Design a protein around this ligand. Structure first.
Ligand SMILES: [Zn+2]
Lengths: 186, 107, 47
């Protein structure tokens, strides 16, 4: 192990560093694309950040309900699936279900038109539903894969399973409490 | 910086068993042989080098220009600067004077 | 704040009320879909 060393501090060249590093890392052997050495560019490893799964290449943005639906209808006009959440009980009542005040849910409602969805100036939204209004807001952003499937129990022995599509976004519906308080003073 | 196997979702390791190294899992047979560069690291760690040149080490670092004190100004303290912690944090400077019986040293 | 645009209506379909399921894969990025790789077998329990 050496002990007597002459230190150096006079300025040196940058491109010298660059050229030396080039010589130490630019002697590529990427041409070694043998049969056993092939990779599927789709089958690459992944960044933990699902939004940034771009660790090695080949060489979420703020959003609001009004802008999201505007994008969904103007720029593109194809079919789309959404996964939305509703309050515990809807403003209806059971349809002669014989009744505890059991909760009124979409599962216990008849088909047909049920309400209207309104976009107003300044970019806030309500679901006009009968004589009440439910506010609509964006949920938590989604990045993992979700698939919408329909399970048909065609027979007690066996059935069939068909994929419909993949979901991309979430919506949340909440009662407008201060509006209810203002209408019915207490 | 870390990678995960898309096949089963686990941390992979590097190993050599053929003509070229490869990024491999260990619970599933996924292999991705590496053939290009990556340009980021884990920022390694080695401790505080303080006295490796202590006192008056190799005099190759003799310099001409220096600042001066606002009070007294005798001819002996040429300038200095140093660094704080790591790669991507600022570098501090102190200006220090010493004849005897005080405690002067500025930042 | 008056209405601006797109007073879209809403309807309820009871055709598949007891038939729809929603699967999700926490460990799989949404950009990497499973449709390409052929499926072979599946099982389920009603209860
Ligand atoms: Zn694994």
């Amino acid at each position: 192990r050496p002990e007597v060393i002459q230190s150096h501090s006079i300025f040196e060249q940058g491109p010298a560093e660059m050229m030396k590093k080039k010589g130490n890392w630019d002697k590529t052997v990427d041409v070694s694309d043998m049969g056993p050495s092939h990779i599927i560019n789709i089958k690459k490893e992944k960044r933990e950040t699902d939004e940034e799964t771009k660790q090695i290449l080949r060489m979420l943005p703020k959003d609001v309900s009004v802008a999201e639906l505007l994008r969904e209808l103007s720029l593109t006009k194809e079919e789309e699936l959404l996964f939305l959440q509703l309050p515990d009980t809807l403003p209806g009542q059971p349809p002669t279900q014989d009744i505890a005040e059991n909760a009124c849910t979409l599962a216990d409602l008849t088909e047909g038109q049920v309400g209207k969805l309104l976009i107003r100036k300044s970019g806030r939204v309500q679901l006009l539903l009968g004589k009440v209004t439910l506010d609509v807001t964006m949920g938590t952003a989604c990045s993992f894969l979700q698939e919408l499937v329909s399970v048909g129990l065609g027979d007690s022995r066996t059935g069939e399973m068909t994929v419909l599509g993949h979901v991309k976004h979430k919506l949340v519906c909440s009662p407008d409490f201060e509006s209810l308080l203002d209408h019915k003073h207490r | 910086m870390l990678l995960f196997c898309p096949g089963c979702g686990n941390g992979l390791i590097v190993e050599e068993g053929q003509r070229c190294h490869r990024f491999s899992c260990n619970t599933c047979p996924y292999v991705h042989n590496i053939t290009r560069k990556v340009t980021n690291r884990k920022y390694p760690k080695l401790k505080e080098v303080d006295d490796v040149l202590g006192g008056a080490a190799a005099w190759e670092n003799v310099d001409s220009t220096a600042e001066s004190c606002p009070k007294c100004e005798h001819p002996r303290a040429y300038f200095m600067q140093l660094q704080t912690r790591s790669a991507d944090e600022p570098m501090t400077t102190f200006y220090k004077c010493c004849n005897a019986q005080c405690g002067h040293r500025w930042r | 704040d008056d209405p601006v645009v797109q007073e879209i209506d809403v309807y309820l379909a009871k055709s598949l009320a007891e038939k729809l399921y929603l699967f999700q894969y926490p460990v799989r990025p949404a950009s990497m879909t499973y449709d390409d790789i052929p499926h072979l077998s599946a099982k389920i329990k009603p209860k």
